[PDB]
Amino acid sequence: ETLNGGITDMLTELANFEKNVSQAIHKYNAYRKAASVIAKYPHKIKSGAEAKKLPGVGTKIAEKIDEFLATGKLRKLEKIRQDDTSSSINFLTRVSGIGPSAARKFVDEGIKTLEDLRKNEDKLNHHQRIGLKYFGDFEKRIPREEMLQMQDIVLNEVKKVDSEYIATVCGSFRRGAESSGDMDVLLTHPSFTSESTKQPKLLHQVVEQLQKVHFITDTLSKGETKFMGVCQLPSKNDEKEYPHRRIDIRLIPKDQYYCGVLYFTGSDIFNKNMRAHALEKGFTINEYTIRPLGVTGVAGEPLPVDSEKDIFDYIQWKYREPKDRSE
DNA sequence: CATTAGA
DNA sequence: TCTAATG
Ligand code: NA
Ligand code: NA
């Protein structure tokens, strides 16, 4: 967590690079397990050799560890960090819709900058187009203060269209977070569950509601169960307009809410942790359900959920307010 | 790890 | 269809 710091982040740096600027999936996967094991090890690594005794730790990474150890740096590390093309990729990546594949491609084309991308907005897809547009607002954080106003409106139309709807705004927001990066709206309806062959419109209805009122202003992607977009809060009585906010709405079989609700609500740890527990308590938790364990090794049969509480009762735990779902 | 675009 | 990008 810190004794092994340098080695981990160094490694990861090493790792992320292969993955993005190169197409080195393996080398990259290589750096990660190492980066991983070396992280678990309870003692200060005092040398490659030392490390090397590890699993996944080979001649190649060891060598790097000594170098880092000996001298507070690494050339390869210093060279990349310098590398303009390379630099390039990492940057272009921030553009929503841009991924490594494109990053490279764009580079090879000579599109290295923000401006570059503009000059050639043609070369760009609508996702990337949007992305391009709201670059600044995309990177900007979302004050709960806003989370609050946003969540309000959303609930409002949800209700307005049909009063049978259930929306929950999951993530850190839900978990008290002073600030979030994008709002995640979990959505379900009685009239939709496991078997009940959809009702795409269920989704559709709302998206369109939201737009009709100017809350949604862009469509990054709309599918019959997962809408992905951009939003904005009515720039008041002038002098102050609201920045472009990434937003996601998703449909869900009312018979799978709470799990999904639980789950998206995190934190990543709280989850893993409760989850770990449900294992002992003879259960199985996953983003959609909760199945009882059968000694044979495994088992199925989804227990019925009506609230976050049911899942709790099931594994006989303490109802944790989302506030303190931190871990 | 599943969903959407797109070509 | 596959392949990329998001989460
Ligand atoms: Na080894
Ligand atoms: Na990106």
Resolution in A: 3.3
Hey, is A67 helix, strand or coil?
helix
Task: Outline where DSSP puts E strands in chain A.
Answer: 142-143, 166-170, 179-180, 183-189, 216-222, 226-231, 245-253, 283-286, 289-292
CA distance A323 to A174: 7
Task: Report residue A127 as tokens.
Answer: 């996702």
**CA angle, corner A149, sides to A148 and A153, nearest 5?**
120
Task: Report residue A325 as tokens.
Answer: 């779902």
Please, are residues A159 and A165 in contact by the beta-carbon 8 Å criterion?
yes
Same-domain status, A203 and A218: yes
Same-domain status, A134 and A145: no
CA of A198 to C1' of C4 (A): 27
Chain centroid, CA A7 distance in Å: 25
Same-domain status, A149 and A178: yes
CA distance A172 to A322: 9
CA distance A200 to A170: 22
CATH number at residue A188: 3.30.460.10
Hey, is A42 helix, strand or coil?
coil
Instruction: Select from A263, A293, A318 the last residue of a domain.
Output: A263
Task: Give residue A296's identity as a one-letter amino acid code.
Answer: T
Same-domain status, A258 and A270: no
DSSP-based helix, strand, coil % in chain A, nearest 5: 50, 15, 40
Same-domain status, A168 and A216: yes
Between the CA of A38 and the centroid of ligand 1 the distance, in Å, is: 11
CB atoms within 10 A of CB A28: 18
Residue identified by tokens 């547009």 is: A133
Task: Outline where DSSP puts E strands in A156-214.
Answer: 166-170, 179-180, 183-189
For A125, list phi and psi in degrees, rounded to 5. Answer: -90, 165
CATH number at residue A303: 3.30.210.10
Task: Report residue A255 as tokens.
Answer: 């018979």
Q: A125: Cβ–Cβ under 8 A, 6 or more apart, which residues?
A: A97
Please, are residues A189 and A164 in contact by the beta-carbon 8 Å criterion?
yes
Segment A10-14 long-range contacts (CB within 8 Å, at least 24 positions apart): A10/A64, A10/A68, A10/A74, A10/A77, A11/A35, A11/A38, A11/A61, A13/A77, A14/A64, A14/A76, A14/A77
Q: Which of A7, A1, A2 is nearest to A56 (CA)?
A: A7
Binding-site members of A for K(+) are 52, 54, 57, 93, 95, 98
CATH number at residue A124: 1.10.150.20
Same-domain status, A170 and A132: no
Hey, is A138 helix, strand or coil?
helix
CA distance A64 to A66: 5
Q: Which ligand is nearest to the CA of A101?
A: 2
CA of A220 to C1' of B1 (A): 20
Segment A273-282 long-range contacts (CB within 8 Å, at least 24 positions apart): A273/A327, A274/A315, A274/A317, A274/A320, A277/A315, A277/A317, A278/A314, A278/A315, A281/A314, A281/A315, A281/A316, A281/A317
Hey, is A237 helix, strand or coil?
coil
CA distance A168 to A154: 10
Longest dimension (CA), chain A: 66
Q: A295: Cβ–Cβ under 8 A, 6 or more apart, which residues?
A: none
Same-domain status, A30 and A121: no
CA distance A86 to A104: 9
Same-domain status, A173 and A268: no
Q: Using CB atoms within 10 A of its CB, is residue A72 exposed (0-12), middle (13-18) or buried (19+)? A: exposed
Same-domain status, A146 and A238: yes
Residues, chain A, total? 327
Q: A157: Cβ–Cβ under 8 A, 6 or more apart, which residues?
A: A206, A209, A210, A213, A215
CA distance A243 to A274: 36
Instruction: Select from A244, A263, A282 the last residue of a domain.
Output: A263
Which residues span the domain enclosing A54?
Answer: 1-83
Please, are residues A203 and A251 in contact by the beta-carbon 8 Å criterion?
yes
Same-domain status, A222 and A278: no
Total domains in chain A come to 4
Between the CA of A55 and the centroid of ligand 1 the distance, in Å, is: 4
Same-domain status, A239 and A301: no
CATH number at residue A30: 1.10.150.110
Helices (H) and strands (E) in chain A, counts: 15, 9
Report the catalytic residues of A.
64
Q: Which of A194, A212, A192, A214 is nearest to A203 (CA)?
A: A192
Q: How far is CA A119 from CA A91, A105, A108, A123, A143, in A?
A: 17, 16, 16, 9, 33
CB atoms within 10 A of CB A149: 14
Task: Report residue A268 as tokens.
Answer: 């990543």
β-sheet bridge partners, residue A183: A247
Antiparallel, parallel or unpaired: β A142-143 and A179-180: antiparallel
Q: Does the nearest atom of strand C lie within 7 Å of A23's Cβ?
A: no
Instruction: Select from A263, A295, A315 the last residue of a domain.
Output: A263
Please, are residues A229 and A247 in contact by the beta-carbon 8 Å criterion?
yes
CA of A125 to C1' of B5 (A): 9
Between the CA of A8 and the centroid of ligand 1 the distance, in Å, is: 17
Binding-site members of A for Na(+) are 52, 54, 57, 93, 95, 98
Between the CA of A76 and the centroid of ligand 1 the distance, in Å, is: 22
Binding-site members of A for dGTP are 141, 172, 175, 181-182, 184
Same-domain status, A155 and A180: yes
